[PDB]
Amino acid sequence: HWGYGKHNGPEHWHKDFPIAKGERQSPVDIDTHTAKYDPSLKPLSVSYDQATSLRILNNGHSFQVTFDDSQDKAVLKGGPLDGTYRLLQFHFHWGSLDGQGSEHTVDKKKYAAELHLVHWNTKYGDVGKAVQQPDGLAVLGIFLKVGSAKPGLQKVVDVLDSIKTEGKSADFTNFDPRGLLPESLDYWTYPGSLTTPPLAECVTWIVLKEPISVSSEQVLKFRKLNFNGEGEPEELMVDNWRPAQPLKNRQIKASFK
Ligand SMILES: NS(=O)(=O)c1ccc(CCN(Cc2ccc3ccccc3c2)C(=O)CN(CCC(=O)O)CCc2ccccc2)cc1
Ligand SMILES: [Zn+2]
Structure with missing residues (x-):
C-alpha cells in the first residue's frame, strides 16, 4: 500500500493512481514574483463559530480531526469560491527536521509543517460526489514555522499520546479550529488536487x-x-509530505499586493 517510504512513497503513487502525473496536481511551489494579484478576488469568509468537532484519528498517514458536516455549521465561502463549502476535517503534514515538512513551498522555501482544513461544496450533496468534480473541494492550507507556541494547538498536541498508532481514535469534541488561524487571510489560490491518494483533481x-x-x-x-499499527515495528510518522509537482498550464493568483 501507498505511503512515504522509499518503496511506496510519492514517486511510486502513479502506478496505482495514474492521475499523479496529471495536469493539475498538488502541491506546487508558489513563486511569489510570478503570482499575479487578482483584484477581482474577494475576501475569504471563514465562518467557524458553530464548528462541531467529533473525533481525532491516526489513519496511518497523518492524524485528523473530523467535524459534523451534516449541516452548514463551519463553512468557507468567498475568495475564489462559488457557493458554500463545509468543513469536514483538518490534518497536518510535517517533517523529521524543522527545515522540511510542508507540501506547498514559497520561493522553494519549505516550512516545518502544513495544516490542511478540508471543505466540500454543498451543491454536490456529499463529499464522495464532490471529489468527482473539478470544483468539489476547497482546502485551506496554512504553513507552520517553529518559534513560539500556538496555544490553540495545545489541546491537539496533548491527546496525540492516545492515538500513537494507525487505527486509533479518540473523542475530540468542542475543539475550536479558529485557534489555528493566523491574523491575516491574505492568500494565494490555484486549481489543484488532493495531495494523497486518490490524488483527485477536485x-x-x-x-x-x-x-x-x-x-x-x-x-x-x-x-x-x-505510521505502523500497534504490534508492528515502530516507524515514526515523519516526512508525510508530497513534494511540489509541475505547475503546467496554471496561474497562481494572489489576493493581495
Ligand atoms: N492533503 S489534502 O489534499 O488536503 C487531502 C484531503 C482529503 C483527502 C481525502 C482522502 N480520502 C478519500 C479516498 C478516496 C479513495 C481512495 C482510494 C484509494 C486510497 C485512498 C483513498 C482515499 C480519505 O481520507 C477517506 N475518505 C474520507 C472521506 C473523503 O473522501 O474525503 C473515506 C471514503 C469513505 C469510505 C467509507 C466511509 C466514509 C468515507 C485526501 C487528501
Ligand atoms: Zn493534506
Whole structure:
C-alpha cells in the first residue's frame, strides 16, 4: 500500500493512481514574483463559530480531526469560491527536521509543517460526489514555522499520546479550529488536487501567506506518532509530505499586493 517510504512513497503513487502525473496536481511551489494579484478576488469568509468537532484519528498517514458536516455549521465561502463549502476535517503534514515538512513551498522555501482544513461544496450533496468534480473541494492550507507556541494547538498536541498508532481514535469534541488561524487571510489560490491518494483533481487550493508559529515541543509531539499499527515495528510518522509537482498550464493568483 501507498505511503512515504522509499518503496511506496510519492514517486511510486502513479502506478496505482495514474492521475499523479496529471495536469493539475498538488502541491506546487508558489513563486511569489510570478503570482499575479487578482483584484477581482474577494475576501475569504471563514465562518467557524458553530464548528462541531467529533473525533481525532491516526489513519496511518497523518492524524485528523473530523467535524459534523451534516449541516452548514463551519463553512468557507468567498475568495475564489462559488457557493458554500463545509468543513469536514483538518490534518497536518510535517517533517523529521524543522527545515522540511510542508507540501506547498514559497520561493522553494519549505516550512516545518502544513495544516490542511478540508471543505466540500454543498451543491454536490456529499463529499464522495464532490471529489468527482473539478470544483468539489476547497482546502485551506496554512504553513507552520517553529518559534513560539500556538496555544490553540495545545489541546491537539496533548491527546496525540492516545492515538500513537494507525487505527486509533479518540473523542475530540468542542475543539475550536479558529485557534489555528493566523491574523491575516491574505492568500494565494490555484486549481489543484488532493495531495494523497486518490490524488483527485477536485480541489480549489487557498494557501495563506502568513504562517502560524508553533513551538519545538509541539512539533516534537507530532514526530512521536507512528505510521505502523500497534504490534508492528515502530516507524515514526515523519516526512508525510508530497513534494511540489509541475505547475503546467496554471496561474497562481494572489489576493493581495
Ligand atoms: N492533503 S489534502 O489534499 O488536503 C487531502 C484531503 C482529503 C483527502 C481525502 C482522502 N480520502 C478519500 C479516498 C478516496 C479513495 C481512495 C482510494 C484509494 C486510497 C485512498 C483513498 C482515499 C480519505 O481520507 C477517506 N475518505 C474520507 C472521506 C473523503 O473522501 O474525503 C473515506 C471514503 C469513505 C469510505 C467509507 C466511509 C466514509 C468515507 C485526501 C487528501
Ligand atoms: Zn493534506
